[PDB]
Amino acid sequence: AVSNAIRRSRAGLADPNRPIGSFLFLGPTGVGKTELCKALANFMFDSDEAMVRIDMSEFMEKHSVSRLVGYLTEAVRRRPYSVILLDEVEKAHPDVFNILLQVLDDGRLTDGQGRTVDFRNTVVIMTSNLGSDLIQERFGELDYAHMKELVLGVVSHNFRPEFINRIDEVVVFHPLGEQHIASIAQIQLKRLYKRLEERGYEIHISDEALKLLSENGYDPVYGARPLKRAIQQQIENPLAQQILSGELVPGKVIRLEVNEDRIVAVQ
Amino acid sequence: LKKYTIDLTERAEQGKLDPVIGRDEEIRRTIQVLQRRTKNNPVLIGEPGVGKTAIVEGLAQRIINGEVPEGLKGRRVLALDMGALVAGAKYRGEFEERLKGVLNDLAKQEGNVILFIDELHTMAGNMLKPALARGELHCVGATTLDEYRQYIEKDAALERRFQKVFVAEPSVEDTIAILRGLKERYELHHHVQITDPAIVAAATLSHRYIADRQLPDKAIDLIDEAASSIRMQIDSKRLLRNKVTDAEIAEVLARWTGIPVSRMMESEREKLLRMEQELHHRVIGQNEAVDAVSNAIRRSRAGLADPNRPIGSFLFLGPTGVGKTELCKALANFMFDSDEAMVRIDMSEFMEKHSVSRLVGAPPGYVGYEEGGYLTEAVRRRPYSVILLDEVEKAHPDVFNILLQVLDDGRLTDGQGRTVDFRNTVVIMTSNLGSDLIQERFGELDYAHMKELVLGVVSHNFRPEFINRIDEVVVFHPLGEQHIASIAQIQLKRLYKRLEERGYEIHISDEALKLLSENGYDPVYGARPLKRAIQQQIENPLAQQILS
Amino acid sequence: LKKYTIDLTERAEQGKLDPVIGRDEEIRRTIQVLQRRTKNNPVLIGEPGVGKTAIVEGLAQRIINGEVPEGLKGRRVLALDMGALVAGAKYRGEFEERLKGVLNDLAKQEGNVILFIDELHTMAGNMLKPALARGELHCVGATTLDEYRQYIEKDAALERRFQKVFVAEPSVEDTIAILRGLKERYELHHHVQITDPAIVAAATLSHRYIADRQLPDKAIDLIDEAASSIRMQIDSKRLLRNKVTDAEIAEVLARWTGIPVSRMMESEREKLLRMEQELHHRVIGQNEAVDAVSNAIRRSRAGLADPNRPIGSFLFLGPTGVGKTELCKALANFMFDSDEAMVRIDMSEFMEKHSVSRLVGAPPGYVGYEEGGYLTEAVRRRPYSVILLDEVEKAHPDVFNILLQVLDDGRLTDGQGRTVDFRNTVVIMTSNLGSDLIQERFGELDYAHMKELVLGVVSHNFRPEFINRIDEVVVFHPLGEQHIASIAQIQLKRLYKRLEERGYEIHISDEALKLLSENGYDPVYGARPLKRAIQQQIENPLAQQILSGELVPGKVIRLEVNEDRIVAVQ
Amino acid sequence: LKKYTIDLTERAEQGKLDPVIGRDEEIRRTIQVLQRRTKNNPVLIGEPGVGKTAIVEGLAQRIINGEVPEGLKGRRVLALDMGALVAGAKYRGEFEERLKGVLNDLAKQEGNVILFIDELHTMAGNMLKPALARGELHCVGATTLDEYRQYIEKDAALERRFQKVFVAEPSVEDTIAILRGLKERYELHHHVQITDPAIVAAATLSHRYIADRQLPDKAIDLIDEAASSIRMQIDSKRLLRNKVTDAEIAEVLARWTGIPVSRMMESEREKLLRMEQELHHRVIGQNEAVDAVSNAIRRSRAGLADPNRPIGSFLFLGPTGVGKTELCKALANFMFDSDEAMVRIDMSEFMEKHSVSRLVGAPPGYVGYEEGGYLTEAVRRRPYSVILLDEVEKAHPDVFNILLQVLDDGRLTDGQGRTVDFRNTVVIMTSNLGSD
Ligand SMILES: Nc1ncnc2c1ncn2[C@@H]1O[C@H](COP(=O)(O)OP(=O)(O)OP(O)(O)=S)[C@@H](O)[C@H]1O
Ligand SMILES: Nc1ncnc2c1ncn2[C@@H]1O[C@H](COP(=O)(O)OP(=O)(O)OP(O)(O)=S)[C@@H](O)[C@H]1O
Ligand SMILES: Nc1ncnc2c1ncn2[C@@H]1O[C@H](COP(=O)(O)OP(=O)(O)OP(O)(O)=S)[C@@H](O)[C@H]1O
Ligand SMILES: Nc1ncnc2c1ncn2[C@@H]1O[C@H](COP(=O)(O)OP(=O)(O)OP(O)(O)=S)[C@@H](O)[C@H]1O
Ligand SMILES: Nc1ncnc2c1ncn2[C@@H]1O[C@H](COP(=O)(O)OP(=O)(O)O)[C@@H](O)[C@H]1O
Ligand SMILES: Nc1ncnc2c1ncn2[C@@H]1O[C@H](COP(=O)(O)OP(=O)(O)O)[C@@H](O)[C@H]1O
């Protein structure tokens, strides 16, 4: 139900005199909050130059609009048929929403563009992905009993309810938790520890860095850097206490042992 | 003139130059800066096609007919073969290669020769300022204002010789006089007959819609295109019409501007008959009452308004969801001929008294100068627009006069450098302070009784100095319940685009209009959640089986 | 023609071409445009390095081995005279006689000759314009992508006769398959055995660490240059290694880029296992952990941090005089053996409304355009550096808005318009925020008992998650008297070497080093008043006594205590 | 063609090349890039003066001496001159037949000629691009780090063919070893005795006082110029030096950057102890100011000054009319013999945030970028000066930060990017703050 409006606006079903939607999209900081436009190099035109993403959270002053309005004819006009993004458009005033009130529809941009801006064959998307406070994940494995519960509590803190009932696709994934941040970000567990896949080598990890601390140092702000701060003490040179520089002979298996949170990886 | 002897005055004595008329207000400068002692090189500056032929190229036709001043007597206007004998080699370097072979003879002519324009912004000019620095080189030039201002900066080998003849376009009436002595060259070439009301349609009707060619340029080729549509009409392989009309001109004018004959071939009084009928193609109605504000723009053609004021000065009071968006665009659809004449600005921005310079413009030096204002830069962009000032009453309780100079003296000055003119505007003000009470009855025979409680209550944020400068306080006619059923079907048009694409018939008999009668006409909240009386019970389960 | 232009199929007949493995689509596509009626001339365009000549070198082995379809079997692939058409043709019309002679010798080759005009943008041009128009010339071009757009792309009738064939660069999975086929030519030239560990690790490693060449060309010349270093091994004066390995491929990448992927032959046990022991020689204090700047260079010496963000992103917050900028000169001295071997961007003239172009470069066509930017050129030139951003809060917020891109993406595009890998650099941002919250709270302050209480720069000048994009916000504690009494000594050993370079020996009785540490200690100002009390209680009488001839060189000078003073005597 | 036998290996055979020392890991990389079958073309890249022309002259001295691998033994390093290939190539296609006539008889040796295009970025030279890729010419380029950027990096199909074998600027300890192996070329051209104190103290003194140059080009020059000064004093009219000593190096730097370490022993050291008498001849009163100024000038002349910071950085707080900018005019009259020899900057002229762009200059791409700013330019010109930041009482942190680096570590960079060292200057800041 995210490309459902493509079955409802690109064909045209679900009352097209509307914005797309800015209710809750809860997420973890870095790995599934803003990443879901980096993994969209696989859909229709292969446009990796669609980078228009805006934080629109605490903009109360009237002096933050004069940067979007010289590189407009360097990236989008050589290849017109593309994807065009916008996400996290959540809490602003009509000082900046005055441009963005006819960008909900109408396709063709007349602010300083003026021409045929063929957004009926390009895409116009708005989402609001406020998953920061008042409800969060922990690490990435829970059930689906926390889908939609806060209407005036998570996104619409001090703004009108006519900004949160004009959404077609009132959808979200889970606030999963508790076990899985080294597996949604398995890029620094799988890929980095089959790094020496040759020379007869294989890096096996202990259950201390797998199931022991898989839950402990939970902070709801940082996420990805304490993965590289609670397991920052075993990767290359604490591994190179007995592996590198003279002990490259095969016939032994790489392992970690029962110690405290910093281990010398002896073989 | 040993190599060639190309003569403009010989082309005048043989009649190869076109017969010229008018343009004697600006031959009385071209000559006055030509027969002088110094500064003897005129340059005709304007838009491309203003009449640079009409002044210079007829002067050779004026020499042999003797009405030129003395001193200019016995002067032959010459030219070069510049356009075919600037060159002579194979490769580059031919910008001014063989100029010296044909510039040395001009010194010997002893104050008789006058060399032609030859597009003197293309002569740049490696040899010209060597040739012109003595001043004996006696010439005429002509270049457009984009190719006169951008071209040179401080050349005292050029501006020492050139005089600023900023030539201008004639008016509406003047270019009609040009075509009377120009229809004698089109009676022989196209072999047609040209009449007197036929030549007025080229000038005065293209004056409002066509601007890409100046006034004695667009009125000449519009004539000669119909005269080139005659043998296209006679000899398309019974239909012999060499007498052209204004209908032949208004044909090819409709194929050129983009707009058809349907809003072109009428007087403004003749479309005024169906003005309300074109108003009420998209206006919810109440045509027994709301034709007062229809008469105000109808009062705007005679001219008994203030000439130091815009066209209109009103108040547009009523509820929301009624015509706050609908009535304002339809005033621009008729006179202002546009769907983007809209300057909707909500005046809830005046929470600070420093926000006078944001809709108008910051001073030079203060932040907010590189982008200008809001109620100025859009009017700088569109000086031919209605202006719509949403929710006036939330101006600062100490600060106003944001809208008084626009109405009293008619003009307004932003903080940029140029005064903004508001003379071709109509102000539309929606200061809803006491008319948000549509829930009362108040509307069975009269619609002003809703307004009578406002004039006792709106004036604490208003002033007596402001309500004088707006003539007719026009009340919004309400959105009745039966009146939704006329103007709600224009939202459905994308599915109307869809239903003819699939060959199916889902056309109704009283099954989809009962939810279209739940948009507007509200007691408590408004039409923003009333729009969701449609999507959650029809659009989900009925037409999700249409892409499958 | 055949006397002059290089016959590429007759080079392939002798096997004098490199075996083009892969690229099956771009040879099919360049055939599918070669057998057309109108507009039948390809141009293999793409980045320089990707195989635009190796397509047509591989088409000429697809032709003589019959793997071409019918209709192009037995077709000769010919090059063009690469500047031998424009060789000693002094006389007017000799180049037109040479080019018509090698055009009219294709019209009497019936259309059985494919011209491979390599580097098409060096072309002439009007003389090929008729023969390309009528399909008589079956040309094949190979311009680059930038050389095929900035070199006569339109020019009237010249933007249709050539049909573009885009040669995209291989992936890493393709390039390993590229290198398996070519390795029998580098084994047979260097007389080494390139190993299959070393070809998967010459395409993975040169994809990460080479930002100008993420090509198939760049995996080849790690394969080609590791094999030449084995020729350095066995031709210079089981034990004499005949194989290149992934330890020999990486030793070229530690010399090509200069990024230390090599530690299986280093004293990392000696040098990189000095946790603070090499940094405590010059940064006394800051003992929250071992050092937490010798943990990000310890996570990634060969590179085992996240390879999409820099080696270390540190905010060095603290009071004044505590060692924030000295840790960036003791780390730059530890990595590169010189204090000044970092990219020190002081935020001097960084507040302006455009100083951004100072450290990233002017836009194209402006006045300082051809000289690059300060930050960008210093990391293109050496990708493994330390980048000190001193007093980063004293910069404009527009500076951070281009400095977000180096902290998360690890890649900062510049004003010229090229992207620069900061993924191997160490980006340190010293700053002075929270300076009052550390002198007050001597243990009560955590890292987050501060980093939101000071907020008018953390919320307004800093972004909400700009402090999330930096890896470790190290907070510096103020120097107690146990510290300043011990950096009296490392500021005095700096002073003894300043005098042994003049031939004077300076001794200090411990009554006097007790006296500097009393006169140079106040916790608000850190440790600059200590070394200000060295240069006014020690070096100020010493310079007078050295100048006036009162202190002979070669004798010892004992800075002993006098009546409330430090005096120097013989 | 055969108008080109430019043999850099017979210049090394006849002993006409200078001995190169200790770049045995950039030669070993230059060798092993030159020994691979596709694009064996190294490009000794690096800053000017670093030693990258003199790596190919250490290839040529190893090929002719047999310290190379035995697949590189007996090669020929040939220095291709761009100027000699374009000279006289007036007619059309004479350069292309000249370059192809070089490429042809480079191929006749069958890869036994190592071509050396010194200043590679000068390669009119349009057509070597296919032959560079196949390994048909073994082409050691040696271009600088900024001239590769603005010619060869622009030809992105040509910088593929070249492997940058980056030549880093050596340390002081690597320059003393470079200089200990080069002094017999300068002891023999000047007929002098360059002693080892004059080599340890010429890669030390030039490595700290010189910042506009590299490292191996500064120390080597100083000794080249101290020896040509000694031979001048040997000839022109024991007590004379046959011997370049460490004091003769400092005399060559004293009149090249401002002030030496060692010229002081005669009468300047008399008038440095007489400084507070000399400064009180124009600034009476304020002994505590004249003593705090004169101690910093003595701390530098004794070599005792912190070599990273400036010589002295003072704040002159006082009332009006008490001599705060009379001391800075009597200081610059003392050490430069003119009152108007300060880099004096009235700080009251930059009361705005944009006024800090006149002390450092405009950024790249602005007006007045190419002119610098008159604090960093006037200190880059004369590095030993007095900087009077007079009336230093502004309300802008942006304009104050500039002095965060001038006073600590002693550097401040142009808008142009050129870092100007303030470690030899005396920054005085005379404000009016404790006045009442
Ligand atoms: N598909 C391939 N199979 C084998 N070798 C390849 C392939 N693609 C490229 N190469 C090799 O990559 C190296 C350089 O590629 P080139 O094709 O010579 O460069 P380029 O991309 O053609 O740009 P040019 O040559 O200036 S037109 C050569 O050794 C080629 O053989
Ligand atoms: N922890 C330390 N260990 C050794 N020397 C130190 C230490 N802290 C300060 N110093 C000395 O103090 C001088 C100035 O300190 P710096 O660290 O350079 O400045 P800073 O501490 O980074 O703070 P600032 O002024 O905000 S940039 C250095 O040159 C050192 O000599
Ligand atoms: N390793 C070295 N051994 C001996 N002499 C050296 C060494 N490195 C540099 N030199 C000397 O340093 C001086 C200048 O170095 P060069 O290499 O000639 O110039 P460069 O470094 O190539 O810079 P340029 O101007 O861009 S050619 C010469 O006198 C060289 O002999
Ligand atoms: N202590 C002094 N010894 C000698 N001349 C002095 C002294 N103080 C002031 N003068 C004279 O007074 C003038 C110097 O004034 P300045 O010293 O330049 O101003 P200032 O004392 O620095 O304070 P200001 O007004 O804040 S710049 C010159 O004419 C000096 O000759
Ligand atoms: N008063 C006039 N009398 C006769 N012909 C005119 C007159 N004004 C304009 N024209 C016609 O209009 C054209 C004007 O040419 P010109 O304005 O010189 O074009 P440009 O400015 O592009 O050189 C000519 O074809 C000329 O015959
Ligand atoms: N007369 C109308 N014709 C078409 N659509 C309308 C009309 N009035 C309201 N709407 C729809 O109702 C929605 C909300 O209207 P609203 O903003 O309350 O109108 P107003 O601004 O006049 O109060 C709009 O998105 C619009 O599509």
Numbering used by the authors:
A (entry chain F): 579 to 647, 660 to 857
B (entry chain A): 161 to 283, 295 to 408, 525 to 835
C (entry chain E): 161 to 283, 295 to 408, 525 to 857
D (entry chain D): 161 to 283, 295 to 408, 525 to 723
Pull text from the paper.
Heat-shock protein (Hsp) 100 protein complexes are critical cell stress responders that solubilize and unfold toxic protein aggregates and amyloids, thereby enhancing thermal and chemical tolerances. They are members of the conserved family of AAA+ molecular machines that form dynamic hexameric-ring structures and undergo ATP hydrolysis-driven translocation of polypeptide substrates through a central channel. To better elucidate the Hsp100 disaggregation mechanism we determined cryo-EM structures of the ClpB hyperactive variant, K476C, bound to the model substrate, casein. We focused on this variant because of its robust ATPase and disaggregase activity in order to capture active states of translocation.
Following 3D classification two distinct structures (Pre and Post states) are identified and refined to 3.4, and 3.7 Å, respectively. The arrangement of the P6-P1 seam in the Post state involves substantial conformational changes of the NBDs in both protomers. In comparing Pre to Post state conformational changes, the NBD1 of P1 and P6 rotate together clockwise and upwards along the substrate axis. The NBD2s similarly rotate upward and toward the substrate axis in a clockwise manner. The P1-NBD1 loop in the Post state shifts upward along the substrate axis by ~9 Å and becomes disconnected from the substrate and asymmetric to the helical position of the P2–P5 pore loops. The P6-NBD1 loop similarly shifts upward by ~7 Å, becoming nearly parallel with P5 at the top contact site, but remains disconnected from the substrate. Based on these comparisons, the Post state appears to be in an intermediate translocation state with respect to the NBD1 pore-loop positions, with protomer P6 on-path to bind next site along polypeptide, above the P5 position, while protomer P1 appears to be transitioning to a disconnected state, beginning with release by the NBD1 pore loop. Notably, the P1-NBD1 is bound to ATPγS and in an active state in the Pre-state conformation, but bound to ADP and inactive in the Post state. Notably, the NBD2 nucleotide pocket of P6 shifts from ADP-bound to apo based on the lack of density for nucleotide in the Post state. In side views of the reference-free 2D projection averages the NBD1 and NBD2 rings adopt a non-parallel configuration identified by an increase in the distance between the rings on one side versus the other. This asymmetry is identified in both Pre and Post-state hexamer models, in which the overall length of the NBD1–NBD2 double ring increases at the P6–P1 seam interface compared to the P3 and P4 protomers across the hexamer, going from ~75 to 106 Å in the Pre-state and ~77 to 96 Å in the Post-state.
